[PDB]
């Protein structure tokens, strides 16, 4: 079984994603599960005050907040996404993320095939 499709994470093991990407002082960390033409999957942590600058993706980007609180901007509007909450940031529309508190997220970006 030499092919792996979900990378940088142990297989056949019970895990806690919030332990796979620790929050680090004044830093942002990522564990990139998938990085291909039509799909990104990444676990992130951002310390309080960190930010992902405004940009647009060609795919729909689903954000699931695993801990803390994140301020999400989609075009004009801001959304405060807390632990256990999810938002889909639509393809082609600028978005940004600000760490209101330190937070961890699963980011699944689904791009045009393939």
């Amino acid at each position: 079984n030499a092919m792996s499709y979900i990378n940088n994470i142990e297989h056949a093991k019970v895990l806690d994603l919030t332990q796979e990407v620790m929050i680090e002082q004044d830093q942002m960390l990522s564990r990139t599960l998938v990085q291909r033409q039509d799909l990104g999957i990444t676990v992130f942590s951002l310390d309080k005050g960190q930010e992902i600058g405004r940009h647009s993706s060609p795919g729909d980007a689903m954000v699931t907040i695993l801990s803390g609180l994140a301020e999400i901007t989609i075009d004009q509007e801001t959304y405060r996404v807390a632990e256990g909450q999810t938002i889909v940031m639509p393809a082609g529309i600028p978005h940004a993320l600000y760490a209101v508190e330190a937070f961890q997220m699963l980011l699944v970006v689904v791009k045009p095939e393939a």
Side-chain angles (χ1 to χ4, degrees), residues 37-40 56-62 88-93 95 108-112:
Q37 189 192 279
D38 69 14
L39 176 66
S56 300
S57 171
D60 285 334
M62 179 171 65
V88 181
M89 315 181 293
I93 306 289
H95 47 73
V108 177
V109 184
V110 184
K111 287 170 269 172

Side-chain angles (χ1 to χ4, degrees), residues 6-102:
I6 292 176
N7 300 135
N8 296 132
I9 197 170
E10 318 168 69
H11 289 195
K13 189 176 185 216
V14 180
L15 309 164
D16 176 352
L17 295 175
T18 67
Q19 305 308 293
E20 294 293 303
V21 191
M22 304 290 278
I23 292 159
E24 308 290 342
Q25 295 193 40
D26 300 327
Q27 286 164 98
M28 179 172 75
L29 275 77
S30 71
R31 192 178 287 261
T32 306
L33 275 32
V34 182
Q35 180 160 21
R36 51 158 83 153
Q37 189 192 279
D38 69 14
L39 176 66
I41 300 177
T42 313
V43 189
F44 278 100
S45 75
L46 285 67
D47 198 17
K48 173 160 73 191
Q50 301 314 124
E51 78 165 37
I52 298 169
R54 203 157 164 93
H55 71 290
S56 300
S57 171
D60 285 334
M62 179 171 65
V63 174
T64 289
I65 299 296
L66 307 176
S67 73
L69 181 68
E71 190 170 64
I72 301 193
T73 306
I74 300 178
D75 196 14
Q76 70 97 146
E77 197 165 334
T78 75
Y79 304 80
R80 282 103 196 203
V81 185
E83 172 180 357
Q85 297 175 341
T86 288
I87 189 159
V88 181
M89 315 181 293
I93 306 289
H95 47 73
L97 303 85
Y98 174 73
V100 181
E101 315 174 348

